User: Which sequence fits this backbone?
């Protein structure tokens, strides 16, 4: 018995949809769902999606509340749809996928992922759910996560962090590092070697290596000396050049995090979505240096050093391709006289 | 288990709410309710009310589908709320009453009319429903309709016509003439002797007596002669003066009906509600004669003749009270030398 | 270069999208598209769909303006999507199909119907367009219409009438009768022998045979006698029983047409979509007889007589399957002593 | 003290804004204005404009309720704004002009037309209002209407008809024929000799000369003979060619009127504004003949005959300029061997 | 080729409008512009303006991204419109001006500021744009900013700070201090001597003089002693009196900034716009002292001291006028026995 008033009952009483029975009074005004509590209306949900308000309300209530892969990982692996769950995209306040399987009548294309309409779609399977590993084994196209080994399949070790109710974290009381498996046209793929973005914040950035601790703590000249980074243009790429009207470089999050301590700056997230490479229209408050499209990536500084130290520095400009978050990220590498000039996620 | 999807199920399968088990998928976008039928969205209801879209949808679905009093009658009798039903105002596309009793969890102020919140409210009771004559006896305030005699209760014979799903009709396969009863502060009230308006249209007006057949068919001069109406100014009051820029008189619907068969005219229904006296901004298409506030009433011409001839014609101006549709309707009577000049519903 | 302003340019200058170069200024406010004409805003389109306003505007502008099958036909044949055109559902003021193929970047699931996403979908092909007969041959699922013979393909002769810009007509200056073909899972399907509904209105109903001319003109008794219909209960089924509170029978449009010339009645089209069998909440204005779910179908009276006379009249009740508009329509047949009691489209 | 509640008071009590003291309670929800009447909300106004709901409500309430020029006339004369009144465009349900002068605090660009902001704008002046003839004399740009002679000002006799509360009529109890005057850059302009469109409808078309009575009554052959119209192609231009898939000709309203009495047809008014030449997407219900852009004009048939016979028939194609409603209307004239092939308003 | 989809292309790919060619899919739901990225809708822009959503979207995309004068300066100088740019009002999330010149078709009153409609309007000219100084020379009314001297015109030196993408800053890598020039009716004006507001924040307030450093660092008694401010009522005016139910004084931002460190308070910005004098409904959290209209100005404390020390302290109350941000700010000065009682931006 699926209904608007029962979904709202579950939200009010269980904090999300929990399969409980019961009903509460609901009123819907424009894009907002209210419920009556002692004669006054209380807001339960504001639709920020392009779906009908009652549809989005139900999908949000039925969101996965376990640690799930970040949306960028699912997108990079080509996931089209989830099996009997909703991956909620907290960066868009919207479902991560258009349709559902066995979740909501208005958005379901099927009740079970074994139905034929699901066969060409890359379905996300959660090994922590009973029988979903076996469903993946029979699936034509799909992506599977597990916490342990799967007999007969070589795993791909994913990122340490996952998303729990919109909080990206490395789990201490829960497991957030999953084994990844992917199947195309019934064939189990080898997932490529990949770096992983670290998914940290500008405001509350925490280092995850001794080099990152040293980058935040030491001065620019001292750090570049200690780790022998002369000629790699970290002054431009990581620390940022604020001397001209266009902001120079500043493509690594830890470089923004170090600057954000001393003086703040404005980042306009003009494509607000989860993606491996993020683009911002940045304005430095202290100097007035700005840049319309500033690509930023949060790589472990050790990984970024390894990437840039593993490149031929002998051509003026060329495309450098790096597998990050299971997708191919193109970089532009500019060199002169054997040293790095700039190195940025390519704007294409 | 009341729910949006169950209400929509009943509408789709039974034409209205019928207490049936079932659910269909529903999407709400702005003020409209849709349901999925074979892949595409079909409109079930457009909210024209000031209530939330899903609330109004339920009240419309639970509308009374038996012949019920016209809203102007219930208004004139001071009805505030209905006992366990919804009187739908088809002229406003909205519930006739703000609140409900045992109908909808969002608008209910009580489950049963015996709850003390209902005592100071005039509750409409339907004697055709089991136990509601008794509920009227026990109610502090109320209006009761019955199809027959209630022992000890002095009846008031209501109008011949009632409203069935927005259609105003004199019932043949159903009864539409009711006994009316009213209680104020626990005390049954004597309802006044009254005329009743005829509730006809301008498009499909039909006479209901020999005098009305005469009016529509005879010219103005021979009708006034046949029914001895000289000095009563039907030339102004009923037939209408279109010679000057301000339209003169034209306050009986039958007069508008006669003119409409010859030349059309525009009626700006600037307060579009059911009421005994209706006001329109009228523009005559043929002559350009117009009037901003032209009050119109549909009395049987026999009745109107009986009212205007009952009058003392020896004062210049006076207010004339007439009981119509159980409410007191003030007229203005202007006379000169023992003949009527004008006689119109007094604009308040 | 597809754009909102270009679509509006085509609407303003060519009456619809015509692939022309140009732009006009457009303002969007709520669900309405306006364009500036000499200083003031003029309404071009009001979105009655569940799609975004600018998306629906484009699909409406790109609607098929040739005679096309009525939506109920395409629905009965299981059509999910159209090949490189938009079938506009004028009864819903919305696209007949959720998605498009090579029409609009926001609704397109493919550019050409050969893309594998289109294979499991029944694609509508128009043989009047170059290359689409071939695209039908190569499609896994599809429905094809042609104006003439396709070599080797066994045709099904469609209805005489088609829809031209929302007008249902039998073409004289254009052809509206098509050959129909259907494919399921790569295999051409034999379309069943079928009757076709006549797609007429209650306002402007016109007979299409001597028997229908007889029905509209003769009284009930002499028509039943002339066409030997005693014991088949046209008194109930076709003419309608208005004596009781529940309206009896009245399931043929021609029967509603006869009654409408005498007294009007209200038809609540509570599922306003094109379908072979239509359901209405009907209220008879003259008598007050009414019915919540009154199924109505517009069969040529000759056909309906041929169907009801084909029936075994020796069982109390049984389901009677009739193929109409290519779909199987279940009727309920109630008999007594070798005469028909009632025969109506079975409410599901 | 201008206010929303005062404007609503005037609408409720006087049918429009009448400068009266008073207030009634108002609720605004989405684009609709409601007022409380005996416990329930009644709709006073639905905003169909691109202005805020309360702003449009005030402008509609302050609309001119005297006979005023039709919007196409004011448009053709280049009017941008009205002096101390609102010309309501009933065909757009919106103000005819973006801004106001001394009408509404939200739309006012000035309190009086003498303010210098009004100088470069063509201001409409109503000589029936005290002092506005003088304001026209002092205005840099303007259009003036009067009911009589203005000393020294050479008049232009306007059309017989005007608009009274959305009703277009030739006044009998009021005057609707005005003298027209126009000023550009402080200099009075000579208005051109012009025909006037008749502003009739397709539903209620009525002839206005013996020739038009002949057209509606006679068959095509005897009318063409009686009025010596052989070789002028009224068979195409006025009567309409419905034999081919593209509808041929049919550019005079009287021709559409004749056809409509026989078989109906659909007119898609895809630019729904008042204009001298109207464009429609037309579909003939009988034949299926259709045309995407069918320009229609309502000239008195006498005038149209006088125009087409004035023409040199010795060129293959040429643009023909005719002054109608004070604006220059380009026609296309196609001839062959001294006879007319087609003559239509040139699509721009 | 100006279009919605191309504006969105520029936003997605260049962070703002950059004249690039290309199109992306766009959907518009209520007041929000979305674009499709890999099958999911991503929000690009939420309309907070009173313009149509697609119009505001285009103007925001075309905003000036160079350091521009703060909106209060432009308003105080009477700027009506900008020449070939959009000044975006980040405090209102709306365009700073109603109309545009050569920016957007829906809002343009002209393509070039030399057109006659621009002559009476005070047009903003940016000397950093080629040929705009010369356009100012020929402009009837206008305001010009430059970074260097203009031959033949005496400059007015503006504030040190300007707005870069909504960030008010004193430019270090860009120039934010402009020369100001103004012309009324073709005559170059002398701009008056003026103080400038400092445009600082409550949260991150930074001193700009040794006296301001001392005010933040020293105690009240110590500071008033060091700078000999006895009798000027800085205890009331600048430090604030929180001992009574009405908050006393507190009209200088640096006084709020000092208090906000120790204990916070609520400021309601009930007219949220850029203005030289700001009014707040303030509630002190620590004490509960509050004031409905508390005018606040951010003057350099040295400038505020100079202003108050340059006044006659001998009358009970009088209006003190000070030129700030090129506009005349009225102050109320209250004195008793030769010392200051209060001194506040006059609430009028
Ligand atoms: C300043 O921009 C960021 O705060 C940011 C955060 C995370 C990432 S990430 N994990 O996609 O590389 C990229 C950028
Ligand atoms: C033009 O005015 C009417 O159409 C009208 C109809 C009915 C009534 S009524 N039933 O209140 O008397 C009053 C006025
Ligand atoms: C009152 O009901 C109708 O007006 C109606 C019209 C047409 C059809 S149809 N073309 O499906 O048979 C069915 C019903
Ligand atoms: C079908 O087209 C019309 O109904 C129509 C009416 C009036 C005019 S008009 N007054 O501009 O000449 C033009 C066209
Ligand atoms: C508490 O109020 C403020 O934060 C504030 C900031 C700036 C200005 S200012 N530059 O207009 O004078 C005025 C007030």
Assistant:
């Amino acid at each position: 018995a699926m209904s608007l008033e029962n979904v709202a009952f579950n939200v009010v009483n269980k904090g999300h949809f929990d399969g409980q029975q019961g009903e509460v009074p609901v009123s819907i005004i424009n894009n907002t769902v209210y419920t009556k509590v002692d004669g006054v209306d209380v807001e339960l949900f504001e639709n920020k999606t392009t779906l009908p308000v009652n549809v989005a309300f139900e999908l949000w209530a039925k969101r996965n509340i376990k640690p799930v892969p970040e949306v960028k990982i699912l997108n990079n692996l080509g996931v089209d749809i989830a099996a009997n769950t909703v991956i909620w995209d907290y960066k868009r306040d919207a479902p991560a996928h258009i349709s559902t399987i066995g979740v909501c009548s208005m958005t379901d294309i099927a009740k079970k992922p074994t139905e034929t309409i699901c066969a060409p779609l890359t379905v996300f399977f959660d090994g922590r759910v009973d029988g979903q590993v076996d469903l993946f084994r029979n699936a034509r196209n799909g992506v599977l996560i597990t916490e342990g080994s799967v007999k007969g399949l070589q795993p791909s070790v994913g990122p340490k962090q996952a998303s729990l109710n919109g909080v990206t974290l490395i789990g201490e009381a829960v497991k957030t590092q999953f084994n990844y498996y992917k199947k195309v046209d019934g064939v189990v793929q080898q997932l490529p070697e990949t770096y992983f973005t670290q998914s940290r914040n500008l405001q509350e950035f925490k280092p995850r290596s001794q080099m990152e601790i040293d980058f935040l703590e030491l001065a620019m000249d001292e750090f570049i000396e200690r780790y022998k980074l002369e000629g790699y243009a970290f002054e431009h790429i990581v620390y940022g050049d604020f001397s001209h009207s266009q902001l120079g470089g500043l493509h690594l999050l830890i470089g923004l995090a170090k600057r954000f301590k001393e003086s703040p700056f404005e980042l306009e997230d003009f494509i607000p979505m989860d993606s491996t490479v993020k683009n911002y229209f940045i304005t430095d408050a202290q100097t007035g240096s700005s840049k319309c499209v500033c690509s930023v990536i949060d790589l472990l500084l050790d990984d970024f050093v390894e990437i840039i130290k593993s490149q031929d520095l002998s051509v003026v400009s060329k495309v450098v391709k790096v597998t990050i978050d299971y997708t191919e990220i193109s970089f532009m590498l500019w060199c002169k006289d054997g040293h790095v000039e700039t190195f940025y996620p390519k704007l294409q």
